Design an enzyme around this catalytic site. Structure first.
Site, PDB file in Angstrom:
ATOM      1  N   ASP A   1       0.819  -1.210   0.000  1.00 50.93           N
ATOM      2  CA  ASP A   1       0.000   0.000   0.000  1.00 50.93           C
ATOM      3  C   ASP A   1       0.846   1.249   0.000  1.00 50.93           C
ATOM      4  OD1 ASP A   1      -2.470   1.305  -0.074  1.00 50.93           O
ATOM      5  OD2 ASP A   1      -2.551   1.493   2.140  1.00 50.93           O
TER       6      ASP A   1
ATOM      7  N   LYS B   1       2.940   3.287  -5.929  1.00 53.51           N
ATOM      8  CA  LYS B   1       2.511   2.420  -7.025  1.00 53.51           C
ATOM      9  C   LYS B   1       3.695   1.856  -7.824  1.00 53.51           C
ATOM     10  CE  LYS B   1       1.697   6.500  -9.947  1.00 53.51           C
ATOM     11  NZ  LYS B   1       0.752   7.384 -10.674  1.00 53.51           N
TER      12      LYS B   1
ATOM     13  N   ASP C   1      -3.220  -3.064  -2.608  1.00 52.25           N
ATOM     14  CA  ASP C   1      -4.337  -2.115  -2.707  1.00 52.25           C
ATOM     15  C   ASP C   1      -4.083  -1.152  -3.863  1.00 52.25           C
ATOM     16  OD1 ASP C   1      -6.791  -0.915  -2.103  1.00 52.25           O
ATOM     17  OD2 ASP C   1      -6.023   0.221  -0.393  1.00 52.25           O
ATOM     18  N   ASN C   2      -5.170  -0.543  -4.348  1.00 54.52           N
ATOM     19  CA  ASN C   2      -5.114   0.532  -5.329  1.00 54.52           C
ATOM     20  C   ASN C   2      -4.537   0.053  -6.653  1.00 54.52           C
ATOM     21  OD1 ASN C   2      -4.154   2.589  -2.610  1.00 54.52           O
ATOM     22  ND2 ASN C   2      -6.192   2.568  -3.548  1.00 54.52           N
TER      23      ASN C   2
ATOM     24  N   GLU D   1     -15.285   6.726  -3.161  1.00 57.36           N
ATOM     25  CA  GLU D   1     -16.080   7.942  -3.182  1.00 57.36           C
ATOM     26  C   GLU D   1     -15.259   9.129  -3.697  1.00 57.36           C
ATOM     27  OE1 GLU D   1     -18.141   8.623   0.509  1.00 57.36           O
ATOM     28  OE2 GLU D   1     -18.629   6.492   0.770  1.00 57.36           O
TER      29      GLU D   1
HETATM   30  C1  LIG Z   1       9.858   5.230  -3.466  1.00 60.25           C
HETATM   31  C2  LIG Z   1       9.055   4.981  -2.233  1.00 60.25           C
HETATM   32  C3  LIG Z   1       7.939   5.799  -1.926  1.00 60.25           C
HETATM   33  C4  LIG Z   1       7.192   5.514  -0.777  1.00 60.25           C
HETATM   34  N1  LIG Z   1       7.550   4.495   0.042  1.00 60.25           N
HETATM   35  C5  LIG Z   1       6.983   4.061   1.224  1.00 60.25           C
HETATM   36  C6  LIG Z   1       5.765   4.655   1.853  1.00 60.25           C
HETATM   37  C7  LIG Z   1       4.593   5.103   1.182  1.00 60.25           C
HETATM   38  C8  LIG Z   1       3.750   5.528   2.230  1.00 60.25           C
HETATM   39  N2  LIG Z   1       4.406   5.348   3.374  1.00 60.25           N
HETATM   40  N3  LIG Z   1       5.586   4.832   3.143  1.00 60.25           N
HETATM   41  C9  LIG Z   1       7.755   2.973   1.653  1.00 60.25           C
HETATM   42  C10 LIG Z   1       7.549   2.142   2.907  1.00 60.25           C
HETATM   43  N4  LIG Z   1       8.734   2.798   0.762  1.00 60.25           N
HETATM   44  C11 LIG Z   1       8.589   3.726  -0.220  1.00 60.25           C
HETATM   45  C12 LIG Z   1       9.401   3.931  -1.358  1.00 60.25           C
END
Ligand SMILES: Cc1ccn2c(-c3ccn[nH]3)c(C)nc2c1
Ligand SMILES: [K+]
EC number: 2.1.1.6
Length: 214
Positions: free
Chosen positions: A139, A142, A167-168, A197
Site C-alpha cells: 500500500d 505504485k 491495494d489501489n 467515493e
Molecule cells: C519510493 C518509495 C515511496 C514511498 N515508500 C513508502 C511509503 C509510502 C507511504 N508510506 N511509506 C515505503 C515504505 N517505501 C517507499 C518507497
C-alpha cells in the site's frame, strides 16, 4: 496541522483506549465527516480481515503506514506471538502510526520500520530476524509494487502460500504489477472490487499467492 495529526487527535478524544474496533470506527467516521478520501476504509478492511483469517499469518509485512489504520486493522486479528512489521518512509507518519497503535493497545505486536522499502527489505533477514513472510500488504508507492515483489523474491522472503495483498491496483493503478503476477506461474491471483467515493470509480485489490520459484 496535518490530516494525520487531526485524525490522531480525534481518535484520542473519541475512541476507547485498548479497543481497536473503536479506533477504526473513529478514523472512518472522522474522515467521512471531513470528506477526506480514506487510504483504506472499512469495506476494504473487510477484505483484509478475511484474508488474515483464511491464511492465519504469524508474520506480516506492511508497506506504507500512513496514520496507522491498516496496522490497527491487521494487528488486531493476529494471534499472541504474531508480528506485524510496517515500513513507512515519512517519519511524521511513523510517529502518528506509533501513537495510534499505542492508543489501540496493539504496540506489542507491531514494529515500525523507518525508511524506504528498497532500503529496508534487504535488512529483514538479519536485522529483523525474518526467515520467510506469511503475508505482505502492499500500500505504498505504485511504482514500487513490482520492483518490491521482485526484491522480496530475490531476498528469499516468500515461500509457497505467502499471500501478497495489493491495494489501489486500478486507481491510480499498478498495471505492470498486475500483468506480472497474473502472467507468472509463481502466483495465483484473485481480484476484489471496491468503489472510491469522491472520484466515483471502481478500484480494487489483488491477492497474489506465491507458489514458489520458477
Ligand atoms: C519510493 C518509495 C515511496 C514511498 N515508500 C513508502 C511509503 C509510502 C507511504 N508510506 N511509506 C515505503 C515504505 N517505501 C517507499 C518507497
Ligand atoms: K499467475
Amino acid at each position: 496541522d496535518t490530516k494525520e495529526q487531526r485524525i490522531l487527535r480525534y481518535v484520542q478524544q473519541n475512541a476507547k483506549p485498548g479497543d481497536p474496533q473503536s479506533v477504526l470506527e473513529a478514523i472512518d467516521t472522522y474522515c467521512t465527516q471531513k470528506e477526506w478520501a480514506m487510504n483504506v476504509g472499512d469495506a476494504k478492511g473487510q477484505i483484509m480481515d478475511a484474508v488474515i483469517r483464511e491464511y492465519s499469518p504469524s508474520l506480516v509485512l506492511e508497506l506504507g503506514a500512513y496514520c496507522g489504520y491498516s496496522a490497527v486493522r491487521m494487528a488486531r486479528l493476529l494471534q499472541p506471538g504474531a508480528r506485524l512489521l510496517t515500513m513507512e518512509i515519512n517519519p511524521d507518519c511513523a510517529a502518528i502510526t506509533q501513537q495510534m497503535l499505542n492508543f489501540a493497545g496493539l504496540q506489542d505486536k507491531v514494529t515500525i520500520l523507518n525508511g524506504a522499502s528498497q532500503d529496508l527489505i534487504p535488512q529483514l533477514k538479519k536485522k529483523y530476524d525474518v526467515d520467510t513472510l506469511d503475508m505482505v500488504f502492499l500500500d505504498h508507492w505504485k511504482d514500487r509494487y513490482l520492483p518490491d515483489t521482485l526484491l522480496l523474491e530475490k531476498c528469499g522472503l516468500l515461500r509457497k502460500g505467502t499471500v501478497l495483498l495489493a491495494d489501489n491496483v486500478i486507481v491510480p493503478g499498478t498495471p505492470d504489477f498486475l500483468a506480472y503476477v497474473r502472467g507468472s506461474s509463481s502466483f495465483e491471483c484473485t481480484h476484489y472490487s471496491s468503489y472510491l467515493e469522491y472520484m466515483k470509480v471502481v478500484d480494487g485489490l489483488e491477492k497474489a499467492i506465491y507458489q514458489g520459484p520458477s
